[PDB]
A paper describes a structure:
Carbamate kinase (CK; EC 2.7.2.2, ATP:carbamate phosphotransferase) reversibly converts ADP and carbamoyl phosphate into ATP and ammonium carbamate. The enzyme functions in the L-arginine dihydrolase pathway, operative primarily in some bacteria but also in the enteric protozoan parasite, Giardia lamblia. CK assembles into homodimers, consistent with the oligomeric form detected in solution. Each subunit contains an eight-stranded β-sheet surrounded by three α-helices on one side and four α-helices on the other side of the β-sheet.
A citrate ion occupies each subunit of the glCK homodimer in both glCK-citrateS and glCK-citrateL complexes. The main difference between the two structures is in the conformational state of one of the auxiliary domains. In the glCK-citrateS structure, all four auxiliary domains in the asymmetric unit are placed in proximity to the bound citrate, a state referred to as the closed conformation. As with the nitrogen atom of the AMP-PNP β,γ-imidophosphate, the C5-carboxylate of citric acid interacts with the backbone nitrogen of Gly13. The C6 carboxyl group also interacts with Lys131’s amino group, located on the auxiliary domain. Finally, the C1 carboxyl group is bridged to Arg163 on the auxiliary domain via a water molecule.
Author numbering:
A (entry chain B): 1 to 244, 250 to 316
B (entry chain A): 1 to 316
The structure:
């Protein structure tokens, strides 16, 4: 209710895609329903919740489809693809949270907000795309893709295969900030900023879309401190941050500020996750949490996960 | 504006598509920008605004893409395509509204909500798909593709040419209504119900999508009344709903009593007509609420609001 602290939670890939599942609808739906049941617990413990997600595989299938059907229907640019993934991802999430609400005989009170994020158009990211999207290929398939379509680039994504890559500039402003705040002030569980937000530039007072995909964690950090949130929570499948064996539990700003200059996090898909938690904790004095989707409430209660706090 | 009366406006194909126009992104955006200018004037008059739209050409496109790409990427069902189209269309609309707000040194206060609409799974519509979506085809390009595409049904979209046709079951409930009313109470300009809502059924307390495209005027009419909005406004490309097309008896519905338009409906004056569901929709709002419903063209909206034009349906 009106009394709850606010937690901003950035769902990950596996809220939706497990390790090399195929992206059909039902598969993703069952994963979302599993996530929703965990989220619900946080709602029931009485925190206000802002939920975000990645959109990596989902925006990549969509851009793939736009490419493959170009001779048959006009191809949409990458920001429009991002928009369409928000609809789809936002649909799945809003519906499963409505269902878990109703199953527990609570009146549904959840929405998905389409979301734009301003970025810098001449960011270096536009001349070296580095953000993996879509499903995994082999280097065998990857090489034919590039041979086949030489505008497109694949790269190795942490031993899972090869993936198409897109420009990923830093998020500067969530355009729908005011509205998101209005909703949370009003006790709505808000889903927003799916996939980091639709990448846009603002020139001459004109917001127009640009072709990128933003880091979900960097955007949610931005969102969380903009909202002056009580917690930033980034969910994975792994209960903590680890190395090489160091398992990070509660750690102070400084020590983890010290571990990241030494690239404990320049090997993992974990660095900017750490980078996003740090910035938020730095900026707000409030705790950021990186845990598994499965121990989320345990973490809030302080029973587990990597928790980062002020000094 | 906290003092404002609320107006629920359904935008038409022409919000996004004009004349035989191609559906590239830039063309459609251009059209949204034009719609947004007109809308801004209603917000600037000081009215609260909930904006809806169709999604027929855009969801059929998306569905086209999923079918063409099915061998290379998993093909998404129609309700999931509906969701994506809200994403696409709501993004265009919000951005456009944002821009016109900024251009007028007014801070952005606008958002699209993904919207689910409940229907009846047994609704006859499911046995008789009727809603044209996507591009137009020759008769012959069409047969070429129900031999090819068994089950996928096409139909003669009104002496313009052939089109895919899908179940259009009647809307029963806007799942996000409460949130939409909360936004409106807080004076946010809300875009929602784009394409009439993602069609869903609710069974045993579980909501799940069904493969359909709901009439967006029916869904909007339903939303307006659930909101007890002050007006419901359906914007098209014709300044008015009309009677006896091409007689010298061709009359122009201007201000008109509920009783009189109902009877006209009953006698089949709009029946073989694009205005059919639009009149049904305004009737249903006005009959439920006593409030004025308006059928106008995008380019004379405020004048309609100001009572200088358009078909304005008033209670008995």
């Amino acid at each position: 209710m009106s009394a709850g602290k606010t937690v901003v939670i950035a769902l990950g890939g596996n809220a939706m895609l497990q390790a090399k599942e195929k992206g059909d609808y039902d598969t993703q739906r069952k994963n979302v329903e599993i996530a929703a049941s965990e989220i619900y617990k946080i709602h029931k413990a009485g925190y206000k919740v802002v939920l975000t997600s990645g959109n990596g595989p989902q925006v990549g299938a969509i851009k793939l489809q736009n490419q493959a059907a170009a001779g048959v229907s006009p191809e949409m640019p990458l920001h429009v693809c991002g928009a369409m993934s928000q609809g789809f991802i936002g649909y799945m999430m809003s519906q499963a949270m409505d269902n878990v609400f109703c199953a527990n005989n609570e009146p549904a009170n959840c929405v998905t907000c389409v979301t734009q994020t301003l970025v810098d158009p001449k960011d270096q990211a536009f001349t070296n795309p580095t953000k993996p999207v879509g499903r995994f290929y082999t280097e065998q398939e990857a090489k034919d893709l590039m041979a086949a379509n030489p505008g497109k680039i694949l790269r190795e994504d942490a031993g899972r295969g090869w993936r198409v890559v897109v420009p990923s500039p830093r998020p500067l402003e969530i355009v729908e900030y005011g509205v998101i705040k209005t909703l949370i002030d009003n006790n709505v569980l808000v889903i927003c900023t799916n996939g980091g937000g639709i990448p846009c530039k603002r020139e001459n007072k004109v917001i127009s879309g640009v072709d990128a995909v933003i880091d979900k964690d960097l955007a949610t950090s931005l969102l969380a401190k903009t909202l002056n949130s009580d917690y930033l929570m980034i969910l994975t499948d792994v209960l903590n941050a680890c190395i090489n064996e160091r398992k990070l539990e509660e750690i102070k700003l400084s020590e983890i500020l010290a571990l990241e200059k030494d690239g404990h996090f320049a090997a993992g898909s974990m660095g900017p996750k750490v980078r996003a938690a740090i910035e938020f904790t730095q900026a707000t004095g409030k705790m950021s949490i990186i845990t598994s989707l499965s121990t989320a409430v345990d973490a809030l209660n302080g029973k587990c996960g990597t928790r980062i706090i002020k000094d």
